[PDB]
């Protein structure tokens, strides 16, 4: 699983791969780990699909009740704080790396990582899931804050692609969603149009010279690819 959420000026981009895996077999190839809580507050779900779906549905329902009774929009801080309480209360029972991210007119775009402990950290960008570990160095090097909405989406997609190229546990579609003052823009990049994969990267075309014909020289030529030669 690879989930991330970066802030641009107006709002946020959540991005996620689409693979749930029972270890080494892909149970679902097209999961939607970007889970609506309110109109403009989503979470990205890493860990036990059961546990995060259950929390996301519980928190979505509390936020809907809350929004009805205050008769106003919900702040992302509220969604994050509810999600933290639940992820903390049950920290021993559940496996659930969450990123709450969204727009509210008070604080604009906000990102909250709620990792496995039930910490809630407010961040400019958050990484989550098995694939997160690949991106920390990618962000350190290539991420520049104060991106456009369009640049953030392109970057978030390029990020998720870099993670799911190396993480076995991540793969499939890259789902993004931009949350800002405007109507939410979801989009789904299929793997055959991903911004990066190792399979298409020219760096990794020439094969490792592992096989090597039986020769009268220590000169490494290439792989033996024909029994006649």
């Amino acid at each position: 699983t690879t989930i991330l959420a970066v802030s641009y000026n107006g709002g946020v981009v959540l991005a996620a791969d689409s693979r749930t895996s029972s270890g080494t077999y892909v149970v679902n190839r097209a999961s939607n780990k970007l889970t609506k809580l309110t109109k403009k507050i989503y979470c990205c779900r890493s860990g036990s699909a059961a546990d995060t779906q259950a929390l996301a549905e519980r928190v979505s329902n509390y936020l809907g009740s809350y929004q009805t009774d205050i008769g106003a929009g919900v702040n992302v801080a509220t969604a994050a704080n509810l999600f933290q309480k639940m992820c903390y209360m049950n920290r021993w029972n559940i496996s659930a790396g969450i990123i709450v991210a969204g727009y509210d007119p008070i604080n604009g775009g906000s990102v909250y990582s709620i990792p496995s402990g039930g910490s809630c950290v407010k961040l400019d960008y958050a990484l989550g899931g098995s694939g997160s570990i690949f991106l920390y160095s990618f962000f350190d090097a290539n991420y520049k804050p104060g991106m456009s909405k369009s640049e953030c989406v392109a970057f978030c997609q390029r990020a998720v692609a870099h993670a799911y190229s190396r993480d076995g546990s991540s793969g499939g579609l890259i789902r993004t969603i931009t949350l800002d003052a405007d109507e939410p823009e979801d989009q789904t990049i299929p793997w055959n149009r991903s911004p990066y994969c190792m399979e298409k990267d020219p760096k990794y075309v020439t094969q490792a010279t592992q096989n090597q014909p039986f020769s009268s020289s220590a000169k490494i030529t290439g792989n033996r690819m024909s029994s006649t030669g």
Binding site: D69, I70, A72, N75, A77, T78, A80, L82, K85
Partner: protein
Amino acid sequence: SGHDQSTDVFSAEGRVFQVEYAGKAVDNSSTAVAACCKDGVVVAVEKVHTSRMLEKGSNNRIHAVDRQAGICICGLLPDGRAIVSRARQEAENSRDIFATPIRGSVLANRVGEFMHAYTTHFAYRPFGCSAIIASYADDGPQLFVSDPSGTVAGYYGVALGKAKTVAKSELEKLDFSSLTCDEAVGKLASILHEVHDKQKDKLYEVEVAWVCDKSDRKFVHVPADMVP
């Protein structure tokens, strides 16, 4: 005779006499007065002192519910303090659970729901106080009054107690679009000094509180220099 013994019983006319009687307790209580301005909101309450030998700040009828919100109690003070204690419990649930200062409109409805609960059941009696909720959360400066029935209403200006009628005549002379919190402290206190019975209730002071831009949207007693 049995129509009015408990709040669980409607009369034939369709009303709840025990809640009307609780309301009588407020209308016989010390006069409270409040004003919602652009700058913030102001609450002034007359405290009728039974004794010359009370400390200053004894039987405070005005209590901070949260940073941004305060309840002034017109009625039975002890009952009022149970509402303040609940209003607090709600204000701290808003911060604990939803990470937000409770909105005035929300806090008021929560106070009204509570006060109403006690009008429905044979085992309990209605509260003997009208709460005046002043708040300056993200919904701006808000003044509400929950009465014994649980009926919440938002006000620009509001008088409660035995001089309710005359104090209202004087609140109607104010322009609410124009006046600031600094004026209001003066005029609300002045109103309470004017409407007060000098021969009946000799010993009294005017406890004023506000929550305005001046006070950092923090609900506090106003200093003793502004009060006259």
